[PDB]
Enzyme design. Structure first.
Site, PDB file in Angstrom:
ATOM      1  N   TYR A  55      61.923  25.661  -7.896  1.00 28.92           N
ATOM      2  CA  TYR A  55      62.033  24.318  -8.557  1.00 28.92           C
ATOM      3  C   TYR A  55      63.353  23.412  -8.528  1.00 28.92           C
ATOM      4  O   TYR A  55      64.432  24.015  -8.144  1.00 28.92           O
ATOM      5  CB  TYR A  55      62.014  24.539 -10.153  1.00 28.92           C
ATOM      6  N   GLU A  57      64.936  19.030  -8.230  1.00 25.96           N
ATOM      7  CA  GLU A  57      64.604  17.455  -8.234  1.00 25.96           C
ATOM      8  C   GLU A  57      65.902  16.842  -7.787  1.00 25.96           C
ATOM      9  O   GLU A  57      66.987  17.246  -7.575  1.00 25.96           O
ATOM     10  CB  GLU A  57      64.603  17.259  -9.634  1.00 25.96           C
ATOM     11  CG  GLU A  57      65.841  17.450 -10.662  1.00 25.96           C
ATOM     12  CD  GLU A  57      65.572  16.912 -11.944  1.00 25.96           C
ATOM     13  OE1 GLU A  57      64.446  16.843 -12.611  1.00 25.96           O
ATOM     14  OE2 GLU A  57      66.743  16.610 -12.743  1.00 25.96           O
ATOM     15  N   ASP A 172      48.118  -0.428   3.574  1.00 27.14           N
ATOM     16  CA  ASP A 172      47.493   1.133   3.263  1.00 27.14           C
ATOM     17  C   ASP A 172      46.659   1.583   4.215  1.00 27.14           C
ATOM     18  O   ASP A 172      45.451   1.178   4.521  1.00 27.14           O
ATOM     19  CB  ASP A 172      46.705   0.806   1.843  1.00 27.14           C
ATOM     20  CG  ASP A 172      46.197   2.194   1.150  1.00 27.14           C
ATOM     21  OD1 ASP A 172      46.365   3.083   1.891  1.00 27.14           O
ATOM     22  OD2 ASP A 172      45.654   2.158   0.440  1.00 27.14           O
ATOM     23  N   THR A 198      47.929   8.599   2.609  1.00 25.70           N
ATOM     24  CA  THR A 198      47.799  10.201   1.992  1.00 25.70           C
ATOM     25  C   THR A 198      47.649  10.884   3.306  1.00 25.70           C
ATOM     26  O   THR A 198      47.926  10.512   4.323  1.00 25.70           O
ATOM     27  CB  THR A 198      46.408  10.315   1.388  1.00 25.70           C
ATOM     28  OG1 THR A 198      45.265   9.737   2.265  1.00 25.70           O
ATOM     29  CG2 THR A 198      46.140   9.538  -0.013  1.00 25.70           C
ATOM     30  N   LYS A 201      43.168  12.678   5.164  1.00 25.62           N
ATOM     31  CA  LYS A 201      41.901  12.242   5.759  1.00 25.62           C
ATOM     32  C   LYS A 201      42.152  12.514   6.892  1.00 25.62           C
ATOM     33  O   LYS A 201      41.725  13.680   7.635  1.00 25.62           O
ATOM     34  CB  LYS A 201      41.966  10.716   5.315  1.00 25.62           C
ATOM     35  CG  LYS A 201      41.892  10.594   3.807  1.00 25.62           C
ATOM     36  CD  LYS A 201      41.404   9.078   3.422  1.00 25.62           C
ATOM     37  CE  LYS A 201      41.256   8.970   1.996  1.00 25.62           C
ATOM     38  NZ  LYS A 201      42.566   8.653   1.195  1.00 25.62           N
ATOM     39  N   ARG A 207      46.297  17.013   0.281  1.00 23.32           N
ATOM     40  CA  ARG A 207      46.302  15.814  -0.577  1.00 23.32           C
ATOM     41  C   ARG A 207      47.501  15.511  -1.113  1.00 23.32           C
ATOM     42  O   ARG A 207      47.910  15.461  -2.439  1.00 23.32           O
ATOM     43  CB  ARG A 207      45.190  16.109  -1.959  1.00 23.32           C
ATOM     44  CG  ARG A 207      44.405  14.851  -2.236  1.00 23.32           C
ATOM     45  CD  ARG A 207      43.035  15.563  -2.765  1.00 23.32           C
ATOM     46  NE  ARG A 207      42.327  16.022  -1.620  1.00 23.32           N
ATOM     47  CZ  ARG A 207      40.982  16.659  -1.771  1.00 23.32           C
ATOM     48  NH1 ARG A 207      40.581  16.586  -3.049  1.00 23.32           N
ATOM     49  NH2 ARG A 207      40.306  16.610  -0.728  1.00 23.32           N
TER      50      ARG A 207
END
Length: 423
Positions: A55, A57, A172, A198, A201, A207
């Site tokens: 974990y 950040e 995009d 993303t 695709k 994802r």
């Protein structure tokens, strides 16, 4: 378990069997959803790694994110002095929201596809109206991207409208990002301030989202070097604003896919997607279908079923019942979002299963047979729900569907499938 090292197949037979069933379903179908693909094993292995335990950040991990950052700029042939990238977005939407929040103040004006519009005569983006409309509206940001366009976007011409009315240009490129990376189509990075994508695709990964932004010198005053100022706003919009800590496992999986996108085999894959899409389009034209924009220069085709006498909702559902997945799509002049005129078909997913052009001609034959059953059924039924229940409850229809289905699946099962062998 006792150890936590037991296999899923041994520890949870019920879940294992669900996964084998889903796997069989993917293997036996013809995936024509233009936004879908089949994730590589290697990316999935990273995603299920011991990075799930770590974990963070804000040793090895920070190496991962920096690595991912570096691989992102590399895959897209970007100068680290001119481009930065935020590799932390969870999905594609966070990528995009992070942008609008970063750059725009409340009730700032925005333009994007829906708004600017396609020219129904040509099925092309009406760049003339965009430019006139934007002189009126003075938008602060303009979004270049669409999910259902079979042609290349004139990023240079959108940069003109933006340079004029002092708007940001966001590209995009989610649907075409693999093609951009392989350099088989022109790159929006030459003209855009911000690019979002993303990674699942045409990049053929998990994802997740990426935000690329201009950094360094924007211009010189003829104070001296005038800098871009997107970085700290984007970064702050991602964390702590819109998200918590990044999924380090997810960031690793992204890095694996971006690395694959740099290889010559990826370029060959990408070339083959274009070929397969053109082959699909030609086979449809040869059987007298109408295509929006009359064909394709990318990974998809948009069929206008209206001159044929069927709509995309009807076609979509028949195809689904014979293990062909596609999407209904609006055409220019359409009245109803419920019964749109069109069917969107894509080459990426099947190209990943080593389909070649001749294999796409075969798919089209199957699609043709499905559309024919839809036309019969439309002739014997009234409402959309009557059409749908007829497919299930009519004996003759049900049997014709079953025969086409068994044939589709027997064809599909013979092709390989990216991922893990069994789940």
């Amino acid at each position: 378990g006792w150890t936590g090292q037991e296999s899923l197949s041994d520890s949870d037979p019920e879940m294992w069997e669900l996964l084998q069933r889903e796997k069989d379903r993917q293997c036996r179908g013809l995936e024509l959803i233009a936004s879908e693909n089949f994730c590589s094993r290697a990316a999935l292995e990273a995603l299920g790694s011991c990075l799930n335990n770590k974990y963070s950040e804000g040793e090895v991990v920070d190496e991962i994110e920096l690595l991912c950052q570096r691989r992102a700029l590399e895959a897209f042939d970007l100068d680290p002095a001119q481009w930065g990238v935020n590799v932390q977005p969870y999905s594609g939407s966070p990528a995009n929201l992070a942008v609008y929040t970063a750059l725009l103040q409340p009730h700032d004006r925005i333009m994007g596809l829906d708004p600017y519009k396609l020219n129904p005569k040509t099925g092309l983006i009406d760049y003339n109206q965009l430019a006139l409309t934007a002189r009126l509206f003075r938008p602060r940001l303009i979004i270049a991207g669409t999910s259902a366009y079979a042609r290349l976007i004139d990023y240079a011409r959108m940069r003109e409208v933006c340079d004029e009315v002092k708007a940001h240009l966001l590209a995009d490129m989610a649907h075409i990002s693999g093609l951009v990376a392989a350099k088989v189509i022109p790159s929006p990075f030459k003209h855009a301030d911000i690019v979002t994508t993303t990674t699942h695709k045409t990049l053929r990964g998990t994802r997740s989202g990426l935000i690329f932004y201009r950094k360094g010198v924007k211009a010189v005053d003829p104070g001296r070097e005038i800098p871009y100022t997107f970085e700290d706003r984007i970064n702050f919009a991602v964390f702590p604003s819109l998200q918590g800590g990044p999924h380090n496992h997810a960031i690793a999986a992204v890095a694996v896919a971006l690395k694959q996108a740099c290889t010559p085999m990826f370029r060959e894959y990408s070339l083959q997607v274009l070929k397969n899409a053109r082959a699909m389009a030609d086979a449809l034209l040869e059987r007298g279908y109408s295509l929006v924009s009359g064909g394709t220069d990318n990974h998809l085709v948009l069929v206008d079923l209206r001159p044929k006498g069927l709509d995309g909702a009807r076609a979509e559902r028949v195809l689904e019942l014979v293990s062909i997945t596609a999407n209904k799509n609006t055409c220019p002049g359409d009245r109803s979002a419920i019964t749109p005129g069109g069917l969107r078909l894509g080459a990426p997913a099947l190209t990943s299963r080593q389909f070649r052009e001749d294999d796409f001609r075969r798919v089209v034959d199957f699609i043709d047979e499905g559309v024919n059953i839809g036309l019969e059924v439309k002739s014997k039924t009234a409402k959309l729900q009557d059409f749908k229940s007829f497919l299930l409850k009519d004996s003759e229809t049900s049997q014709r569907l079953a025969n086409l289905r068994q044939r589709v699946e027997q064809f599909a099962r013979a092709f390989p499938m990216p991922g893990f062998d069994e789940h």
